[PDB]
Amino acid sequence: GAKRHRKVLRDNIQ
Amino acid sequence: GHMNSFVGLRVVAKWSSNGYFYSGKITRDVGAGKYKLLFDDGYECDVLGKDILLCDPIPLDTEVTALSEDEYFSAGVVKGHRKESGELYYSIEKEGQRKWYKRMAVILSLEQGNRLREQYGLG
């Protein structure tokens, strides 16, 4: 169907 | 209340790789009208003043893009608000039902963000 289309979000940034 | 000139404020900013507008905190006035933005996703980038919206809690009935944490993308419309754990949320209606998303996930597509630039733009 669809999925993240542009750069957003990250992880371990805290 | 209390405020400071740009530095520290949560705002919405354009991702300079000709992208959409995403939530971020102004880390520093870089200079010449650039302000660096620690996006709430943890990216950190210079953005020019005309490309930052500082009084932009999304107005209801505005069309916006929405991103699930499991990285699914759609677009829909703000139809309400929430506050939870000191973070600001929007009920994005899509397919005639409300879905809760958070400021950094309620991203303003560039033609949406343009309509706010004329009022909320720093530049």
UniProtKB/Swiss-Prot annotation, chain A:
The modification N6-crotonyllysine is found at residue 3. The modification N6-propionyllysine is found at residue 3. The modification N6-methyllysine is found at residue 7. It is found in: Nucleus; Chromosome. Residues 3-7 bind DNA. Belongs to the histone H4 family. This is Histone H4. The chain holds residues 15 to 28 of 103 of the full protein.
Curated annotation (Swiss-Prot), chain B:
Asymmetrically dimethylated on Arg residues by PRMT1. Methylation is required for DNA binding. Phosphorylated at basal level in the absence of DNA damage. Phosphorylated by ATM in response to DNA damage: phosphorylation at different sites promotes interaction with different set of proteins: phosphorylation at the N-terminus by ATM (residues from 6-178) promotes interaction with PAXIP1 and non-homologous end joining (NHEJ) of dysfunctional telomeres. Phosphorylation by ATM at residues that are located more C-terminus (residues 300-650) leads to promote interaction with RIF1. Interaction with RIF1 leads to disrupt interaction with NUDT16L1/TIRR. It is linked to A chromosomal aberration involving TP53BP1 is found in a form of myeloproliferative disorder chronic with eosinophilia. Translocation t(5;15)(q33;q22) with PDGFRB creating a TP53BP1-PDGFRB fusion protein. It comes from Homo sapiens. Homoligomer. Interacts with p53/TP53 (via the central domain). Interacts with DCLRE1C. Interacts with histone H2AX and this requires phosphorylation of H2AX on 'Ser-139'. Interacts with histone H4 that has been dimethylated at 'Lys-20' (H4K20me2). Has low affinity for histone H4 containing monomethylated 'Lys-20' (H4K20me1). Does not bind histone H4 containing unmethylated or trimethylated 'Lys-20' (H4K20me3). Has low affinity for histone H3 that has been dimethylated on 'Lys-79'. Has very low affinity for histone H3 that has been monomethylated on 'Lys-79' (in vitro). (Microbial infection) Interacts (via C-terminus) with Epstein-Barr virus lytic switch protein BZLF1 (via C-terminus); this interaction is involved in the activation of the viral lytic cycle. Changing residue 41 to A: Loss of interaction with histone H4 that has been dimethylated at 'Lys-20' (H4K20me2). Abolishes recruitment to double strand breaks. Loss of interaction with histone H4 that has been dimethylated at 'Lys-20' (H4K20me2). It is found in: Nucleus; Chromosome; Chromosome, Centromere, Kinetochore. The Tudor-like region mediates binding to histone H4 dimethylated at 'Lys-20' (H4K20me2). Interaction with NUDT16L1/TIRR masks the Tudor-like domain and prevents recruitment to chromatin. The UDR (ubiquitin-dependent recruitment) motif specifically recognizes and binds histone H2A monoubiquitinated at 'Lys-15' (H2AK15ub). Phosphorylation of the UDR blocks interaction with H2AK15ub. Residues 4-123 are annotated as: Tudor-like. This is TP53-binding protein 1. Changing residue 43 to A: Increases affinity for histone H4 that has been dimethylated at 'Lys-20'. No effect on recruitment to double strand breaks. There is a cross-link at residue 83 (Glycyl lysine isopeptide (Lys-Gly) (interchain with G-Cter in SUMO2)). The chain holds residues 1484 to 1603 of 1972 of the full protein.
